[PDB]
Design a binder for this molecule. Structure first.
Ligand SMILES: Nc1nc2c(ncn2[C@@H]2C[C@@H](COCCP(=O)(O)O)N(C(=O)CCP(=O)(O)O)C2)c(=O)[nH]1
Ligand SMILES: Nc1nc2c(ncn2[C@@H]2C[C@@H](COCCP(=O)(O)O)N(C(=O)CCP(=O)(O)O)C2)c(=O)[nH]1
Lengths: 173, 178
């Protein structure tokens, strides 16, 4: 590991962007008949969690690459009724946050609504929940990077790494 | 001959923005070299102001990390006493927002405080204000991209472009509903 605060690099910046391009192609095809256009009818991007800003910034730019115009909202509301909504989240774990955000947004009745997460932790669920688009899976380990923090730190790490246990063991004390 | 059907001209590409952000990142490293910036213990507190500033913030913190500047980010659209604060903003124009934030933040008595803007309109000031770091200047022209929006749209354009007048001449008359 090139990082002195990590035991392993799980996904590099290039790997994530490669995967996110595969997802952007699915989104473009998926919404091909939604008549998405700037101002008139963009895809409403609802970014959840403070750390999601890194992923949201890269995803929205990649989405524009594939002809998907967007409009970003942050909850870390606008006018979603009748409009297509895509919730983005950097990590999906217990799914308790996503379920609540999805259910509440439905109260506004948008044309459609789907979710996209950068890191899915399939093994952390406390309720059933599947995201329409997943960039990468991560086992049951504490990772930081790509916006994911440990106590507000390491968000800027370009890759998704396993935080060396000596880091958070010494920081709690 | 523009690559964007909605823009008259492209001012700064993503790559050019990053090349500039690399030069800025080196200066910040030198400037804070005596501050012992360290993750968790003493990170440089990044205050990102303005909704569209998430794009510049996402890229800037990452570049800064490349140059040995560990950061933690807050958003304005925490404890700062004794900490080093770098306010980040995608566009600086009248300076009214940045003046409010900086002077409101000085009340908490941080270790220091500076500002870094991606786009500085030197000629738009309503009050005097100079940013400590500026990635690039822009004149009296309406631009979009790199997080800068026109009515929430076009933030995702990877470059800072001048938006075609027909777009906002048309959309304004559409916003006129009543
Ligand atoms: N760095 C890092 N964090 C992890 C990891 N596993 C879980 N988490 C966090 C833990 C908690 C707080 O998250 C603040 C995010 P923030 O600071 O940006 O606000 N979470 C949620 O509550 C999401 C519920 P879900 O998404 O399932 O609905 C996700 C990991 O492995 N590494
Ligand atoms: N896209 C684009 N916007 C421009 C341009 N010139 C000015 N603005 C805006 C105008 C107003 C709205 O700001 C939206 C931020 P948001 O919608 O993301 O929240 N602003 C401020 O008040 C900054 C306070 P200052 O900089 O003086 O301290 C900046 C341009 O050329 N292109």
């Amino acid at each position: 590991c090139k990082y002195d605060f990590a035991t392993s690099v799980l996904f590099t910046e290039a790997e994530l962007h490669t995967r996110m391009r595969g997802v952007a192609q699915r989104i473009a095809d998926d919404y091909s008949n939604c008549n998405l256009k700037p101002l008139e009818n963009p895809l409403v991007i609802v970014s959840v969690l403070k750390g999601s800003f890194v992923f949201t910034a890269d995803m929205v730019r990649i989405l524009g690459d594939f002809g998907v115009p967007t409009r970003v909202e942050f909850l870390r509301l606008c006018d979603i009724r009748g409009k297509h909504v895509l919730v983005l989240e950097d990590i999906l774990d217990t799914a308790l946050t996503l379920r609540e955000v999805v259910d509440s947004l439905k109260k506004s009745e948008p044309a459609s609504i789907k979710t996209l997460v950068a890191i899915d932790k399939p093994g952390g669920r406390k309720i059933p929940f599947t995201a329409e688009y997943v960039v990468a899976d991560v086992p049951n380990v504490f990772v930081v990077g790509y916006g994911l923090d440990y106590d507000q730190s390491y968000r800027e790490v370009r890759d998704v790494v396993i935080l060396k246990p000596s880091v958070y063991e010494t920081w709690g004390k």
